[PDB]
Symmetry: D4
Subunit: 231 residues, 8 copies
């Protein structure tokens, strides 16, 4: 004990001595309140953020929680693709003077997706790993592009020094009944991309995702199996 901290409209669940999952909620007609998960990482003397909340106001609340509970500057934020639940709060990050990073493709896609682009673009080598020159001061954040799946631009993040890997919206939990919103999905390459994510972080035992509590590696396998049925 104790339990997941409620701060404002958000929930923070500590996953590791230096890692927290931030959760925000959006009301969707019929589907109740839909949770979206991101991460907060303390690395020495600075905080790293993965994904925004649904909105600018919710994202501001994240920064407030950080200030109150951690009290270290937020050095940077990386967002995992151009959808509202991951990049809906970019303005809040920028207003706070936080350097933001996204896949170059995410920034390209941002206008048509109605999102505000990140200030900096990540570029990835042919093997999927981020080119280090485009990801300065990322520290323990290992960024990997597994290929097109949930979206064309979806990227994933592993946390060095932990057993945690963040699949974002590419990954669903081990009992999910569907792959959810496939509006921007690449049905052909989805399955391969899921498995590439698993191979990129072969030792991760806690898989964090956007819309379900952290699961085991079974989440990866189950998602890839659902994705096979699309091609």
């Amino acid at each position: 004990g104790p339990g997941d901290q409620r701060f404002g409209d958000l929930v923070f669940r500590q996953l590791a001595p230096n890692v927290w999952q931030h959760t925000s909620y959006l009301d969707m007609p019929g589907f109740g309140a839909v949770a979206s998960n991101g991460l907060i990482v303390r690395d020495g003397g600075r905080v790293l953020v993965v994904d925004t909340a649904w909105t600018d106001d919710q994202t501001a609340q994240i920064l407030n929680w950080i200030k109150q509970e951690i009290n270290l500057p937020v050095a940077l934020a990386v967002v995992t693709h151009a959808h509202q639940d991951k990049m809906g709060g970019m303005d809040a990050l920028h207003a706070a003077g936080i350097a933001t990073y996204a896949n170059a493709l995410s920034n390209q896609l941002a206008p048509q997706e109605g999102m505000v682009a990140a200030q900096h673009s990540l570029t990835f080598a042919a093997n999927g790993w981020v080119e280090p020159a485009t990801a300065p001061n990322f520290g323990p954040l290992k960024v990997f592009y597994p290929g097109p799946g949930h979206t064309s631009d979806n990227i994933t993040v592993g946390i060095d020094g932990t057993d945690i890997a963040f699949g974002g919206c590419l990954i669903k939990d081990s009992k999910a009944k569907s792959l959810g919103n496939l509006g921007d999905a690449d049905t052909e390459h989805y399955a391969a991309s899921v498995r590439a994510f698993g191979a990129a972080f072969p030792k991760a035992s806690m898989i964090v995702m956007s819309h379900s509590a952290p699961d085991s590696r079974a989440a990866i396998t189950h998602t890839a199996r659902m994705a096979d049925k699309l091609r």
Copy 2:
């Protein structure tokens, strides 16, 4: 009763309490007067236009008919590809201060096709549906890119709250003897694109097209069959 209204050089046929088909004519050496069809949609307190007439003057006549018969501001116009019969009257729309929208590819293609580009570009998700952020205030207009067919950029429009779907020049009537002008056609993907249009609006029973009176879904099937013979 009564019949199709003649206004100036144009004909307007009411298809629904809030939908009219606008028809303009161009003299083509040998082929008599060739009709081109577009749509006019009343949605609450504003009018939406699909496609221009062959010319700027004819398009001005459309706007005049709207003012006389409907008397609501034309909020926007969407044009379905970069050919004279669909975008020949862009200048008239722009002179009237009407916001115009086309497929991004249509605007790219406009100069080589001798057309004036729309002021705004539509972008489509991988599944063919327009990204909502690029189509503000479209209301009941459901815009879908079925893939290359009549042209590389041809798009289609369904009207929510009705049984009407507009195939433009992609679709021919159920007894057409050919697919017409294939000067910019994608013979390989034409058939698949036609069928994608049909699947995108599976409940539509009135199929509107550029050069023939509204037909049934048989128009879709027959067009796809003719298109099969090209690949």
Copy 3:
């Protein structure tokens, strides 16, 4: 009777049968709650907005008030310069699909001022009046650039069919003790610009401004006199 309507955190004061002043408030350390004024114009079947509120949330409240009290589409919005109290709520307008307009210089200045640029740029003739081609569907809104003053980009708006002229932050009331925030001011040309505004709308008897209740033409004279002391 009755009095100024309170809606959410905002106040709306009707100035004319088709004109309302919208007021929003921002807490400034020491200066209490500082009011910023804009305008709302009903012109036939559509609403025109002049200036946003301080914030996106407050601006959303403006749109909500319009929907409840007027129930007509907001055809466009024009913002009078790149400062928070005039352009702080651009995102809210854009999210609502409202076409936004600003001085071309305002859009140029927006990034350095930390503002979101308008979607469309206004250009002005040498005499100060907006070039009509860049201001489509403005209706009764007569837009005039009086020259540099409060800022380099500040523009003014007269409302045809009324005795109302909006000076924005260029004009202060007839008893103001100073010209306020001169952080971006052109001290040399301020006085001349104020007088140009007065001459541009010579018949206006109700002068609306950003931070004080509507005043008479004495507001113009008094502001110009204060501005003389800067050069």
Copy 4:
């Protein structure tokens, strides 16, 4: 004998064995039908056009008159500034495949003036004469930029081998009561620009202008005198 030829809605007056003045009319509320004048020049085996008519349709009529009465290809057209009466018919010229030329500033100004830009830009030396490299195949057309006056971009044309100089809208006849539309005028430099035009073509005895029948050099002097009263 005989008199000025009426062709369609236009009037053509022969000024020289190889020069005609083309006149088109636009209805202006109160000011009756307002004439705008341009020039047509036969130079050997090709026709040169100075200025369009008010509209695209009227400009098409010019080309038709040329074909019927001269029957030589229109090698090029030069337009004298970005206003409707001079550049309102650009689309007609471009549709006919005619190479169009304007002051670089005119093309820059075209969008805000609601005009279609010329395809090619003229650049002028410090002395006001067109740089020959930017005016290929102009033949007897001597193009001169006298400085800002009626507009910032207004240019003038002399016809080599004749006593004719075209002042466009910069020049008014010797009994004009005002300088007309000063909406885009440079009141400071107008007078000097008029006199520069006169000095550029010191031997011209027939001065052609936009809105009045050809006059003598008294038109230049009288215009410059009216312009003096603006500074």
Copy 5:
């Protein structure tokens, strides 16, 4: 009688009452003097040029021959790809004020090929035929892009009203021992492109090419057969 006219360093052979072949020579170490052929077309009252000579000086000689023997303005020139023998004389054309046209790809390729780009870019429909809007005043010149072969950008020209088709360097004579310079060749698509050229001008009986006297359709067949051996 009589024979092929020698003018300066060039040879002109009349192929039709309004068509001449222009030939220029360049010394290549070992291969003697290598001839390159282009075309000259009289169409009414103007001359059309296909391809330049090897050099600017030789191209100037072409223009001089035209002036002496035809005495009509050269309305335009089209060049068939970005190699020295086809575009080596662009500067001479531009100095003479002649509007030049090339495949858009040719202009893109011009810098790396050490060529001066044409002033205007031709764009081709999916079927290979030039989009008319990009080829104004081409008259009897029917321009067709057969696909990649000799180069990626090579285009071909048929002359309406004659039995002549110009294959440029894509086509070799019916007894050629090789396809010559394949330095920029597309060995995979060469054969298909040759046959597409033949199909595009199915009635042409005189096939003109760059490096050999006009041949029959056997030149097309033989070239395609040689090209088959590359894939």
Copy 6:
């Protein structure tokens, strides 16, 4: 005690509990070893750097000294103009992943000055103070553009919470015999710019400059007097 710390080839002199002056040296033929001064500021949990050293290697040594003696991340660096002694070490900062800032004009000037541009551009209001939106996380660093002097782009920095103002190369000590390198100087505005710097930081009692130990406000007065003799 004790004295100025020697670290590598550099000297660090503590000016305040959170401010150090960094000094690097470059051998100039005849003028011995020429010192260039910058600043290092500790603000809470991060370090701020003003100006680089002469070279990349020397600048790397600065970062090493910071790590050893302070052990806090360098959040950002601001450089005061595009000359070797101020921006010669940009590559070292960028290699370390440090966000760099300069006057927009400095970045514009960087190529011609042979300098590497900063990653971010500072923009200044008309009154000379930096627009806050372009200077995120600057903390106690108050950046002011005094106008052209030593160079066109020279900027100055005050340190909030101290009596220190940094004039860079604009200011010389109170006994300097000349204004030094005037190769890029604005001789007309130099004097006024010096006095503007003094007025911008009216309470500063320790004036830090590039080439001489910290002096009093007499440095400002004396520099302005020398600058008067240039106009």
Copy 7:
């Protein structure tokens, strides 16, 4: 005798009367000091450089060695791909005023690879050989793009008048146990690219590479065999 010259931190081994191999070293955690090889070519009265050293300082030492041992201007440098060991010293070359050349793709890739781009871009024909117009004054340097392998942009250089071909990092020695760093490798096309290199320089008997002493053609064969196991 004698042996390989040690100059500063570098080693120079003469391969031919006008060719030297330059070697620089970088400490890699665990892998000892890793050598990277480039070439130096004397061609008449000027020196040509292939590849930089790991660092700017090491590259400066190369230039110093050239000055001391050869004493001819370095006309140009060509770098073989965007990695530290080949382009890490670009700044040193540029500071010395040496014209630098790289594959256009290398310059495109330079930012994401953290490299400084070359000043000029090489473009290659479809057959792999450099387009001569983009490689002026290269002399005996025959530059060939074999296709993607070690990286997407890797190019190779043969030295005319010698038996030497430089494979860079594409080629490993005849007993290498792996293909080394495959972080940016194209595993699919690597093998074919290696063999293309061999075919491009079929007579070369001394194969020079980045990380091993010059070997025979067995290096090519062995590398291609290792590369086969990747696809």
Copy 8:
């Protein structure tokens, strides 16, 4: 003895052991054959060229003369303004692979002047001297922008190690009757610019110019006196 060498159509006069004046001629209707002068400088092991000849062919002859009489690579060429006599032969320099340099303004002006731009742009400090970073390997060539005169872009060159300064077309000989072609002249600043040139090279005793044999400093004084009469 002996006299000025005639090579082809050109004359070369040796001014110093390492400096030659190159002269080319162009026939101008009435003014006989007009000479234009440039310079050739041997600096160690390479040749530097100042200005081209009137034409590409004449410029090629310059390069041929250099090869025959000096036999050293031409490292670079600098051209002194965008007029035919100074930049008419740029193509010849570029074809030979010679790096060309001009005032940035000259390159900007080149298209309108009908000139081919230099490959590299020179930028000048406020004092008129070229910024060294933009003039690599210039050696003894001291380049100075004296301000607008003959043209807006005219630059001047001094030769270190000699008593020679090249004024180009800015300077006329000590008995010239006029300032010649003032078509692009700045009549206001001409005089001051001439005197600035004189002050920039205060020790030069041989003044070289475009259209007259080398003169004394009296050429400078006399030119400045003629220029005074223009303002």
